[PDB]
Amino acid sequence: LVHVASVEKGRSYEDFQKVYNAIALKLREDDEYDNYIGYGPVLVRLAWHISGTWDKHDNTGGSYGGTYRFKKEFNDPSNAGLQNGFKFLEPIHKEFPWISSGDLFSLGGVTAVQEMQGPKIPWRCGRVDTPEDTTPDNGRLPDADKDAGYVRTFFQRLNMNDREVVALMGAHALGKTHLKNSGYEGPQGAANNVFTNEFYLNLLNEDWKLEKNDANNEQWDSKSGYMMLPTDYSLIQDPKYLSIVKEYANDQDKFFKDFSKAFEKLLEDGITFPKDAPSPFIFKTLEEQGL
Ligand code: HEM
Q1: Ligand 1 binding site (Cβ under 6 Å of any ligand atom)
Q2: Strand order in the sheet with 227-228
């Protein structure tokens, strides 16, 4: 399988910046969502879920085809709750119907991060919508009641090493779990929607307690009212993971750089970029545009 990146016919940077601006502006305006968390987190999660279905073995899945748009994918239990981000993007797509889905879902995650004050993530256009049959089967996304071994092994399928895994996980500082979606609940609330290295600090700083929740699942709850998934917690049980966690807890800049690189990578997995392809774009935030 070869997925070659094909620039939307006749569009340039400026055309892309506009879609970005539209998402951003809508993010600003719809701030009531999930009790004032906003849609940032869910968009980030959505961009990670359309991309984490990738299989470096056979090159199937990944962000390329925008297959989330189909029933199979769309109704994937691990995707429970992502429909809200989809609905959020829907009108934007309507406004800019020439953008591919894969491009849209992915751009939302980028805009979200940048608008939530995270680092700039270079982004590449060119994803192409594939047919319904290219939709990966369910079961490709990671479970949360596991440990480091599982995690390590899991991410390998996506070509991510240890530093990449830890950098990517710091996105867990955003939003929250919802009992109805995944069977986990918390923070005890409420929540975060600024991008920072907070995830690491919490993990190292709190006094976590293992407890079962209303869905009959275990989770690590802290006195401060926070929570961590077992898989989250696992980054401190593993010696290799732990030193990286510590590193990020100490240097937000380090964390931002690595996150940036890993995120782009995650979103570009499985795609082939012709030589003639335009470089990746770095979009300006609203604020940088004075909007
Ligand atoms: C071991 C790997 C992972 C597991 C098992 C995990 C699983 C989870 C779970 C169970 C949810 C909460 C869903 C809900 O109830 O709405 C969550 C939330 C979230 N995921 Fe992850 N995830 C992992 C990795 C990722 C990564 C790498 C990213 C992106 C960089 C990420 C981004 C987020 C965001 C931002 C939220 C909060 C969403 C919201 O507030 O609705 N997660 N993840």
Answers
A1: 41-42, 44-45, 48, 81, 142, 144, 151, 168-169, 171-172, 174-178, 181-182, 184, 229, 231
A2: 208-212, 218-222, 227-228
